[PDB]
């Protein structure tokens, strides 16, 4: 659609080598399932405190909406991001304000009490939020893409406190009706949005496509896929989960996976996972489905480069996997050297820092572990670190190119939602 498109001056679907997610307890708190959390009380109040997070005395922390925009201020103008700012003070404020009042309520009077005053929020607050991050699927979707992360948040704001009515529906006091209401508003909710978030990942998916180069469309186009999994299908897993169960209270164990941007020099090989489907990407970069979970890396294996000027470099790397699955990231070659190895026991691959450096050289690569201990691959020549990390998201894969050379020359990573029952709370 060629027309007058004021946006598009800053499309970039380029996933930031460090990169948020403020939805990140958001997604691993309601996945655990909320009464599973330790110390906490009711479920208005716990959601109250992810979406509008606060520490008792000082700090003013941005709430999740206002995070997700100093984000978004890099893909869209001024203009947009006022008119951003304009619904978070306004609808969202509102909202934030009507609920701690009825959670005040629900702690002094109790639920029944506060009956009217919750049906008065989904009333007026929450039916209808959704559509001030909308936009028309119209083939020039730029704008829905870039203000996807703001959808999703408000999705997911409505839905739990919608779904807390039916977990809470004898305390309320709730008729079948009220009931019947509520889940009709959750199921049309989903479903609209659902439809709407696929459907603008497969025009992203093409769009970013459309818009690249032999040099960055593996950035691209992982990139708006990466985007599209933690800002929009992360959050419709739970959402579903919830829609299924007709409750808030559940339990999601994710197994979308996501993707860094790459480190080094243009690769065929990246560039044939990025133009392929997301379907079809295989270890090491995607992990195998291994059960209800993913396949976890058990060990890595490493060896460093034949030196080149003065540096050995990252030479090949090699994973093993719980299901005893031994790949091989970059082949052997005559002076590979300083072979290593180390066991996750258990742990999981927190980051990642990365230097490339001349000629087509990873120079370096450190893996920072959850337990504390490091890995090192690698020698920094004299060049600065890059690190790979998704706030709240681990490590879960891998990928290197040696390009036809002795030494790895690309390298990215893959990232899961943080598993509190793999790893604890």
């Known amino acids: 659609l060629t027309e007058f498109n004021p946006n598009n001056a800053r499309k970039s679907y380029l996933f930031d080598n460090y990169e948020v997610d403020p939805n990140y307890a958001f997604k691993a708190m309601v996945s655990f399932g909320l009464s599973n959390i330790p110390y906490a009380g009711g479920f208005l109040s716990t959601l109250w405190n992810i979406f509008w997070p606060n520490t008792p005395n000082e700090p003013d922390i941005e709430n999740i909406w206002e995070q997700l925009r100093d984000r978004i201020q890099d893909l869209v103008d001024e203009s947009i991001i006022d008119a951003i700012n304009g619904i978070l003070d306004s609808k969202i404020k509102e909202t934030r304000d009507k609920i701690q009042d009825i959670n005040e309520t629900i702690e002094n009077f109790g ?40 959808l999703a948040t408000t999705v997911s704001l409505q839905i739990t406190y919608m779904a807390c009515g039916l977990d809470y529906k004898d305390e309320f006091g709730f008729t079948d009706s009220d009931v019947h209401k509520l889940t009709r508003n959750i199921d049309k909710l989903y479903d609209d949005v659902s439809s709407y978030i696929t459907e ?12 690249a180069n032999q040099d960055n469309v593996y950035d691209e186009v992982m990139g708006a896929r990466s985007w599209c999994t933690v800002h929009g299908f992360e959050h ?12 808030v209270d559940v339990f999601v164990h994710s197994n979308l996976i996501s993707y860094s941007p790459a480190v080094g020099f243009p690769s065929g090989n990246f560039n044939y996972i990025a133009t392929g489907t997301e379907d079809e990407i295989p270890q090491p970069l995607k992990p195998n489905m291994f059960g209800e979970r ?26 093993t996997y719980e299901n005893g699955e031994v790949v091989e990231l970059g082949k052997a070659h005559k002076y590979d050297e300083h072979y290593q190895s180390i066991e ?4 999981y691959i927190k980051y990642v820092d990365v230097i490339a450096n001349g000629p087509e050289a990873i120079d370096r690569i450190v893996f920072h572990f959850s ?28 990928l290197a190119d040696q390009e036809g050379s002795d030494k790895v020359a690309a390298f990215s990573v893959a990232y899961e939602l943080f598993h509190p029952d793999e790893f604890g709370t």
Not at 294 to 319: F, P, Q, T
Not at 344 to 347: E, F, I, V
């Open 294 to 319: 993913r396949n976890r890396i058990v060990k890595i294996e490493s060896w460093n480069s034949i030196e080149i000027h003065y540096y050995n470099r990252v030479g090949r790397l090699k994973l």
């Open 371 to 398: 337990d504390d201990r490091t890995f090192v691959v690698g020698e920094n020549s004299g060049k600065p670190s890059v690190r790979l990390q998704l706030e709240g998201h681990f490590i879960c894969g891998m």
């Open 111 to 150: 639920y029944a009490a506060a009956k009217d005053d919750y049906i008065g929020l989904v009333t007026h607050y929450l039916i209808g939020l959704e559509e001030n991050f909308k936009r028309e699927l119209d083939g020039d979707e730029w704008l829905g893409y870039a203000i996807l992360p703001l």
């Open 236 to 247: 419709m897993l739970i959402w579903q989960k919830i829609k299924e169960l007709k409750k």
């Open 200 to 211: 603008l990942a497969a025009w992203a998916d093409n769009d970013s496509y459309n818009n």
């Open 344 to 347: 996750l026991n258990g742990a």
